[PDB]
Design a protein around this ligand. Sequence first.
Ligand SMILES: *[C@@H]1O[C@H](CO)[C@@H](O)[C@H](O)[C@H]1NC(C)=O
Ligand SMILES: *[C@@H]1O[C@H](CO)[C@@H](O)[C@H](O)[C@H]1NC(C)=O
Ligand SMILES: *[C@@H]1O[C@H](CO)[C@@H](O)[C@H](O)[C@H]1NC(C)=O
Ligand SMILES: *[C@@H]1O[C@H](CO)[C@@H](O)[C@H](O)[C@H]1NC(C)=O
Ligand SMILES: *[C@@H]1O[C@H](CO)[C@@H](O)[C@H](O)[C@H]1NC(C)=O
Lengths: 148, 98, 50
Amino acid sequence: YGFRHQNAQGEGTAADYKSTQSAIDQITGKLNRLIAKTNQQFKLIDNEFNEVEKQIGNVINWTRDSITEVWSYNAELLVAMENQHTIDLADSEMDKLYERVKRQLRENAEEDGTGCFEIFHKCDDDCMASIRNNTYDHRKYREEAMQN
Amino acid sequence: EVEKQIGNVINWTRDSITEVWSYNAELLVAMENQHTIDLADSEMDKLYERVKRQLRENAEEDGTGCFEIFHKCDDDCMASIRNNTYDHRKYREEAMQN
Amino acid sequence: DKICLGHHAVSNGTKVNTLTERGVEVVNATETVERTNTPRICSKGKRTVD
Ligand SMILES: *[C@@H]1O[C@H](CO)[C@@H](O)[C@H](O)[C@H]1NC(C)=O
Ligand SMILES: *[C@@H]1O[C@H](CO)[C@@H](O)[C@H](O)[C@H]1NC(C)=O
Ligand SMILES: *[C@@H]1O[C@H](CO)[C@@H](O)[C@H](O)[C@H]1NC(C)=O
Ligand SMILES: *[C@@H]1O[C@H](CO)[C@@H](O)[C@H](O)[C@H]1NC(C)=O
Ligand SMILES: *[C@@H]1O[C@H](CO)[C@@H](O)[C@H](O)[C@H]1NC(C)=O
């Protein structure tokens, strides 16, 4: 996740550490839960070179292809569930980033709804760097904002 | 004395089914945990914003999980927030002076 | 002046394995895997032949 800003000193794409690493760790946990080892050892139940029994080989093939259809349905459902969940936990901290900005500039504000900002005044890059510090304050000329 | 091949087949089948269900049980609970924390965090939004769409013309905002005001009123206000029964319209004409 | 909102937190909670983390400090828990048995054959409602 990132930023981009426009003021009288310049422009340029910023970035932010807090919710970025939160996002990368949730998927890394989602990785390391799933990117992991099946601890159970599966033996060799049917032959490859000579003459397994006709009925129980059909039973094993009925069982394996069921289990193959069990896991591949599970694998297709899991990944599609995790994809939808990953895009859920990718879109989620848009809300967790974008509204924690909007509950700080709030009495300056009207709103356009692009993913962006508006203001009553013009201040330097000391403001916009502090947005990434979660450390913005407003209270010093609200008495002039009603004139705006 | 179960038969050697079909006991290996059953153990191949059971440990598959054991790996089927334990993967399912680990995935289910972790899905349900993530869903429970999803349906625990969800009605923060469903509680906190249905408060903010009632005090809204008084408001600026700090963003802690909390409130702000233009005036000071007694506990008849804050008990009615839990009643979902708050009203504002009686001195908006004074709030522009604030 | 103001109010706040919040929730409830026990001071010593349980750690659960979510989908994208391990050991999350959660308020309460249950246990889908029952380990404690009753070490006898609970057989009321049946005619039971030892
Ligand atoms: C079981 O299936 C495999 C391929 O899936 C095949 O090579 C084998 O001949 C089958 N065995 C029987 C007994 O049908
Ligand atoms: C932002 O954070 C840095 C280091 O965390 C600090 O030096 C700086 O004073 C903060 N504020 C601004 C406005 O850059
Ligand atoms: C099947 O597995 C159980 C334990 O999982 C073991 O006690 C038993 O001897 C195994 N049987 C065969 C035929 O491998
Ligand atoms: C809140 O609800 C109670 C009972 O539901 C009612 O008696 C009371 O008048 C309501 N309003 C306030 C301000 O307490
Ligand atoms: C948690 O669930 C248990 C059920 O085992 C219940 O007894 C308890 O009251 C619940 N709440 C807390 C805070 O432990």
